[PDB]
Amino acid sequence: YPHCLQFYLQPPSENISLIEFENLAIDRVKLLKSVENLGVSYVKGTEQYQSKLESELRKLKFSYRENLEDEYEPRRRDHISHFILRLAYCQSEELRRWFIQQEMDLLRFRFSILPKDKIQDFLKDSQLQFEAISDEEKTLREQEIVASSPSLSGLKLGFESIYKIPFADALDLFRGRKVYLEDGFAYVPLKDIVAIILNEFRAKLSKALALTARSLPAVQSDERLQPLLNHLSHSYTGQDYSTQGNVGKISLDQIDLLSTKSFPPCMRQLHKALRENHHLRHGGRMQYGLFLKGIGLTLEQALQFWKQEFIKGKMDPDKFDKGYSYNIRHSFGKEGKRTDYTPFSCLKIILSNPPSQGDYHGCPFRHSDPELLKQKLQSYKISPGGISQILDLVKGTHYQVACQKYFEMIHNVDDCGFSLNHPNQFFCESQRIL
Amino acid sequence: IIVGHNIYGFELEVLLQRINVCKAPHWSKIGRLKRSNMPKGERNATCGRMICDVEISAKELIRCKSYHLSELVQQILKTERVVIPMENIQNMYSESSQLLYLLEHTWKDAKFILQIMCELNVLPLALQITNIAGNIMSRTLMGGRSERNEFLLLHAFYENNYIVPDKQI
Amino acid sequence: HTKEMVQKMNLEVIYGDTDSIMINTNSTNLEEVFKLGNKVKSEVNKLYKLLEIDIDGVFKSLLLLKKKKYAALVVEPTSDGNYVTKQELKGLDIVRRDWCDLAKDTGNFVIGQILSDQSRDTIVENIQKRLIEIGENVLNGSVPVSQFEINKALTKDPQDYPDKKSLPHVHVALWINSQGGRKVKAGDTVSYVICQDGSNLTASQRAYAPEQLQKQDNLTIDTQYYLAQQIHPVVARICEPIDGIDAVLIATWLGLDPTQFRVHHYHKDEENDQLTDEEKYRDCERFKCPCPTCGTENIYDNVFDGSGTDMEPSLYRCSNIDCKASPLTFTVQLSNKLIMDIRRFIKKYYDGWLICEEPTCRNRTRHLPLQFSRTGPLCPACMKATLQPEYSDKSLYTQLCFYRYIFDAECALEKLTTDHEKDKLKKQFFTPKVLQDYRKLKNTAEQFLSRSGYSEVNLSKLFA
Amino acid sequence: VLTCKIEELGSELKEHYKIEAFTPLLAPAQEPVTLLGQIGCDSNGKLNNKSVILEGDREHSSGAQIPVDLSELKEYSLFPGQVVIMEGINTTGRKLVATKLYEGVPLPFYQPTEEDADFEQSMVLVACGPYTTSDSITYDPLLDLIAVINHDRPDVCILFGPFLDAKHEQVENCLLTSPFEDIFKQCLRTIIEGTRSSGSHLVFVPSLRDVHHEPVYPQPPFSYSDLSREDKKQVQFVSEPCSLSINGVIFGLTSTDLLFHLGAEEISSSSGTSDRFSRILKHILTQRSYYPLYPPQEDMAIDYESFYVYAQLPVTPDVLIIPSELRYFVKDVLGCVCVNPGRLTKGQVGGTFARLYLRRPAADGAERQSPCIAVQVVRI
Numbered sequence A: 001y002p003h004c005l006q007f008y009l010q011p012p013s014e015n016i017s018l019i020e021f022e023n024l025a026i027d028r029v030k031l032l033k034s035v036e037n038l039g040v041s042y043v044k045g046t047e048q049y050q051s052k053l054e055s056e057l058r059k060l061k062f063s064y065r066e067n068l069e070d071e072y073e074p075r076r077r078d079h080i081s082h083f084i085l086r087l088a089y090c091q092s093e094e095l096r097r098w099f100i101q102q103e104m105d106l107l108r109f110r111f112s113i114l115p116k117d118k119i120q121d122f123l124k125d126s127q128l129q130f131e132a133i134s135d136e137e138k139t140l141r142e143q144e145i146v147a148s149s150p151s152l153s154g155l156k157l158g159f160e161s162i163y164k165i166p167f168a169d170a171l172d173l174f175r176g177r178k179v180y181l182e183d184g185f186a187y188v189p190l191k192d193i194v195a196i197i198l199n200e201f202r203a204k205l206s207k208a209l210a211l212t213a214r215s216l217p218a219v220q221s222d223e224r225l226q227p228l229l230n231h232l233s234h235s236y237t238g239q240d241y242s243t244q245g246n247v248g249k250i251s252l253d254q255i256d257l258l259s260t261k262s263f264p265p266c267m268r269q270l271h272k273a274l275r276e277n278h279h280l281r282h283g284g285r286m287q288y289g290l291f292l293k294g295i296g297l298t299l300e301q302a303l304q305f306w307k308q309e310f311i312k313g314k315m316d317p318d319k320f321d322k323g324y325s326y327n328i329r330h331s332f333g334k335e336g337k338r339t340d341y342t343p344f345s346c347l348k349i350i351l352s353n354p355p356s357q358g359d360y361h362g363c364p365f366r367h368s369d370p371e372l373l374k375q376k377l378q379s380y381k382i383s384p385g386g387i388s389q390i391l392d393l394v395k396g397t398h399y400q401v402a403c404q405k406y407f408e409m410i411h412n413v414d415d416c417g418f419s420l421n422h423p424n425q426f427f428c429e430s431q432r433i434l
Numbered sequence B: 001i002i003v004g005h006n007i008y009g010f011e012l013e014v015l016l017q018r019i020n021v022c023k024a025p026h027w028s029k030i031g032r033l034k035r036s037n038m039p040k041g042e043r044n045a046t047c048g049r050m051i052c053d054v055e056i057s058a059k060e061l062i063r064c065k066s067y068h069l070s071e072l073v074q075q076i077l078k079t080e081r082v083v084i085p086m087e088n089i090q091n092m093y094s095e096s097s098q099l100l101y102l103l104e105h106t107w108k109d110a111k112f113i114l115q116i117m118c119e120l121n122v123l124p125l126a127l128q129i130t131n132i133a134g135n136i137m138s139r140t141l142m143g144g145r146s147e148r149n150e151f152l153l154l155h156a157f158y159e160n161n162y163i164v165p166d167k168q169i
Numbered sequence C: 001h002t003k004e005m006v007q008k009m010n011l012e013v014i015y016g017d018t019d020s021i022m023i024n025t026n027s028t029n030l031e032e033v034f035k036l037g038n039k040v041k042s043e044v045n046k047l048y049k050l051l052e053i054d055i056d057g058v059f060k061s062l063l064l065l066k067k068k069k070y071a072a073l074v075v076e077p078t079s080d081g082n083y084v085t086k087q088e089l090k091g092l093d094i095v096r097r098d099w100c101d102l103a104k105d106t107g108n109f110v111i112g113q114i115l116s117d118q119s120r121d122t123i124v125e126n127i128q129k130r131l132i133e134i135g136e137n138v139l140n141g142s143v144p145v146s147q148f149e150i151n152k153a154l155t156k157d158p159q160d161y162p163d164k165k166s167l168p169h170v171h172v173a174l175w176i177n178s179q180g181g182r183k184v185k186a187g188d189t190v191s192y193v194i195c196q197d198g199s200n201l202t203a204s205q206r207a208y209a210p211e212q213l214q215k216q217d218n219l220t221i222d223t224q225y226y227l228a229q230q231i232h233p234v235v236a237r238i239c240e241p242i243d244g245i246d247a248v249l250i251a252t253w254l255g256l257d258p259t260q261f262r263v264h265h266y267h268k269d270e271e272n273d274q275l276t277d278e279e280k281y282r283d284c285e286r287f288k289c290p291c292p293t294c295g296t297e298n299i300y301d302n303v304f305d306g307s308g309t310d311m312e313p314s315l316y317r318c319s320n321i322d323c324k325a326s327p328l329t330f331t332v333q334l335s336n337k338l339i340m341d342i343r344r345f346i347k348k349y350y351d352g353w354l355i356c357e358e359p360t361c362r363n364r365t366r367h368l369p370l371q372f373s374r375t376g377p378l379c380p381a382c383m384k385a386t387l388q389p390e391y392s393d394k395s396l397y398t399q400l401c402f403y404r405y406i407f408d409a410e411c412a413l414e415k416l417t418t419d420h421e422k423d424k425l426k427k428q429f430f431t432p433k434v435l436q437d438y439r440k441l442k443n444t445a446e447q448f449l450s451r452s453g454y455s456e457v458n459l460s461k462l463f464a
Numbered sequence D: 001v002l003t004c005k006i007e008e009l010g011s012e013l014k015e016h017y018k019i020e021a022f023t024p025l026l027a028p029a030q031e032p033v034t035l036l037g038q039i040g041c042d043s044n045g046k047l048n049n050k051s052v053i054l055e056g057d058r059e060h061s062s063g064a065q066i067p068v069d070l071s072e073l074k075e076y077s078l079f080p081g082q083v084v085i086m087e088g089i090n091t092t093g094r095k096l097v098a099t100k101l102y103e104g105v106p107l108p109f110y111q112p113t114e115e116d117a118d119f120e121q122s123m124v125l126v127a128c129g130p131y132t133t134s135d136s137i138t139y140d141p142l143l144d145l146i147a148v149i150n151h152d153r154p155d156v157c158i159l160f161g162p163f164l165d166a167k168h169e170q171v172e173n174c175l176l177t178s179p180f181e182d183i184f185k186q187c188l189r190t191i192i193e194g195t196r197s198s199g200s201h202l203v204f205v206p207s208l209r210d211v212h213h214e215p216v217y218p219q220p221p222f223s224y225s226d227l228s229r230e231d232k233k234q235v236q237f238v239s240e241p242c243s244l245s246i247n248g249v250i251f252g253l254t255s256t257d258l259l260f261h262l263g264a265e266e267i268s269s270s271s272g273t274s275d276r277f278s279r280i281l282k283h284i285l286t287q288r289s290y291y292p293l294y295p296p297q298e299d300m301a302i303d304y305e306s307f308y309v310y311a312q313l314p315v316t317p318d319v320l321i322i323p324s325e326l327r328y329f330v331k332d333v334l335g336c337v338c339v340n341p342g343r344l345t346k347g348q349v350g351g352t353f354a355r356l357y358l359r360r361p362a363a364d365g366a367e368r369q370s371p372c373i374a375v376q377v378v379r380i
């Protein structure tokens, strides 16, 4: 309904508090990250795609109830967020391509929502010139427009409006004899029009992003804005719920079954390696110990678990208390943070501390070879079509979507109903299903 | 060629000042041009003789924790180098054997300096660098990468009929 | 671009500066390392034509502290597979010469185990085992007395030191001068130990000569000083970079230090790369104000006091059981005390104390040097380190946001889980009169936060 | 800020004394050299003859520090943060043996116009707080001052803070039953209403001990909005420090105890028969700032980016008002009449205030002609 579409131009000249500056950037990253996931898991013209994207847009407050024209809260949030997020993604070329790609899907979706009458006003308020024609002229040149149209079968000329644009602006259409031309003007339907609009927006955005990276030295001096420029996708999750603290009740005699039914693949492999060799290296110990803390183990239970597992390795009981109890006791407590007290997230597992030979930590979908991953999935009692889907997803660098598919097929459901970005979240959603 | 250590940042100035303090005869013999009055500079004093500083050339050619003569011998030459503190120099004048130690130490440093130059091949390398760039040998021994390559570009533009920038100051 | 390519082939870039790149390979076969190295060569040289990378060397082990500050095992390749590993250190010299024999002996052991060829789990176990024993030995007095002697050289006459009282070696030299015969002068060295007198004086003022240690009975060696101020700095400067080891952990191995030690721990050192209200406001100082009637000190850390059913506004009843005065009545005094508490932190920030980042230096100064390194001001005591503010602007900003947060009843009510409990107490304690009282205390902290401190961000300067 | 301060003062000093060139601090030189830098101590304590260091400028020495040996220096006067030009010997490049200390040069005086010579004789009254005894809230000295103002009917009255002292026992123990702001407005209203019949203009200068105001130097003017149309013509709020032109006469106003800070950390060669206050005042006038000392006192907040633009002397003032905890005085230093009236209340007993006459004489004469013709420090 509303005029939420904008060609992002004329940077804001306002001033904002630091809290709003951080919140807008985080929210925009969340929105753009979920647009890509929706695009990967679905197609652009289904009911599910539209419904989920619209619900998410409602949730993040980027289009909602009205206000006095200028300080329209969602419009203002959208504008400031876009221009803030340009700085983060201007640096690298791979980041630039990602930002350009994801910022056009949202514009396509928003243009798909406009009513049939507001498009002309939006176009006129846009760059310089787009015009529509009345039904009289449309019927006057109906046959010629139909003949000039491409090889699309039949004479189905519905009620969709037809726009007249200067021929040069429709270059990519008229050099192939795919539009009707009359006195320097081309008559175009809606689909090619939105294609032209998207191409122009892409060109302008690419120009602006290329220009922004030039003048970047002027913000890097700010100490408050260093977490924005460098680390908006690095190792901290965009928004995380499964954290330290929390409540839970887990019995020690049940971990064997929850390993088969509830644990994600990474924790499954760590648990198997620990139960087989009676030992784990430093990375595996940290990852699996933090995971076990997240799901509801207590200090006494953790000490008992690790001690009872490490005695079978033919060591002296007292050596454990002398050397390994200290780290476990340190983990559950006070300061020394950011790697020692917070359970690992999916992004941190994926993009940091790659395993070596003899190491069983990391993400299976990322560090395992496709053949080895295939054999791993076969031992998991997975249907061959599921392996074909998962390996296809993995090849496209979408590891977490592959893990989502694994969750769905293991629990025998069509859709998980969530976006996975943390192993503890994988355990919690699995326990919720029961 | 005169080889020394910390010549360009100490000994050359001290020597030139002590020469005119006691009014030594014919200071100009330090150079190659007969001159009457001396300036108050150092590079102009010894015209005709190129001075090689082992401290300056070591930085360009090798990486060390410090570029003192004691540390230079330890890394390049692999040999200890004892030091005499400047406070003790007075107390070595009271006996013949002690004052021969001071003379012996002085002689050894001169041979140590000559050894570091030959191992690093400073002299053959200076000739080759100068011939490629096309500048004055005394200037490349003093130091300064920019001055050397400036002459390389200057030669290139001249042979291709160009107007070159005037020297700035 | 090069960094992106290397991380795509499952390799880690641990440093790179404009003429060098350090790459972690996770490989143990040297033949594979060169094969892996030549693959990076072709990858970069595929996109460009003239720029070419070249192999420089191989390290079998590394301890990356900073640029030109590391301990590594360089590989010197012999014929056909075999090599010789050479110990190589740079930038690991301590400027101070006032360390005891026990501290220097411990320091060489830790560096010695690091440059071994064993795995990480073996190194940490050996280091932890030794440090556990050392703490035990010190407490039982099994260490010889001569191990604790410290020697420092005077540069001036003792009566010309401005810091006088805060310098342990000057304090002893003053006692030597006035008590007996021979007189110390500039250039002389002084030997001293730190003992317990029962006089509560500072560790700088409890310095005694070694002779007086056995000659006198009422004094004994201060084990707390040597464990925390002598042993810990030397070990921590090497073992902190190791993953899984933290400065608080070393203290735990050595005694009953950790809780007190973590108060003396740092705040910026944890910055390796939003946060919750519980973890964001954990180093901020609680608001304290005595009761005008009974005098008992009151602690304010949240809007509500208690948990579950019996949770009430913190400003409802006095903490003293015998006192029946409501702090909500005494609102003017609370607001006045707030203002007094904020000028304290603003003045503390503007003091300008800088402290060196090196654990063995820790130079404290209020004078900002005009010689800057790449990171910040360059320390004038040890010429290779950067000074850092003792109280940063982020700590001052977070402190004022904490005062605004313990009096914000508006935001503390939407934070409640169930909509039924929020209604039950809003009609019970939070009368419209009560809501107005919290608004006056909240606006006191907001005046100081309003336009100052750059909680504000200027977008006009940021984009244009 | 610090670099620009050093370079500007050094450039002006080089222009005045016509020296040839400055030498880097770390460069050895057997002949005598002329160095430019700022004085500082090598530790966190009090400066003395043995702990002096000189820190150079960025353009020449790139911020290097060297020790300074003052054994061979006959007469000197040094405090931390002083931009100075030394001449000495530095043979090794790690220590300077100072031999000559160039004297500082002050700013030119204000140049009167033709209008400024047509003004008539005026009387000015000056008082500084606190305006109440240390054991009471009654504010009796304030009422006595108001009575004196009403009796004398001067032309201008300058009142320095604090009006609500931050060090008062009742303030610092929070025994007051009213907000600080309300008490401050009460005091201000009492002052303004009580001197309405006099017709004398009122100037209020803030202090760093004012509890309700911002504790950062330099300070902005006081906030007061409850003024009628009549009172807006007689009451004026200025900052701290301030330069005030009163009938073509330049007044330098500062509330900070600069005399008590500079004198606590200043070393000199002569101690038997010398005037400390005159020497400190000469330092103040030749350093061209309202606070030359760096680092400042332990409890003294300074914002340097604003200190650079709002706390510089524009010219050498005709009269400099410098309230302080030291004994009251009036001294003529370098053509400037420096007046210290003291605090109006000292402990549990009363203090003093000051009165001045101003009238600018004829243009021509023996160069300097002080517009201030009579000063008197009087008990309250």
Ligand code: SF4
Pocket: A264, A265, A266, A267, A346, A349, A350, A362, A363, A364, A365, A399, A400, A403, A422, A423, A426
């Ligand atoms: S995607 Fe995340 S939860 Fe799934 S296996 Fe990888 S790290 Fe574990």
Ligand SMILES: [Zn+2]
Pocket: C291, C292, C293, C294, C295, C296, C318, C319, C320, C323, C324, C325
């Ligand atoms: Zn009480």
Ligand SMILES: [Zn+2]
Pocket: C356, C357, C358, C361, C362, C363, C379, C380, C381, C382, C385
């Ligand atoms: Zn330091």
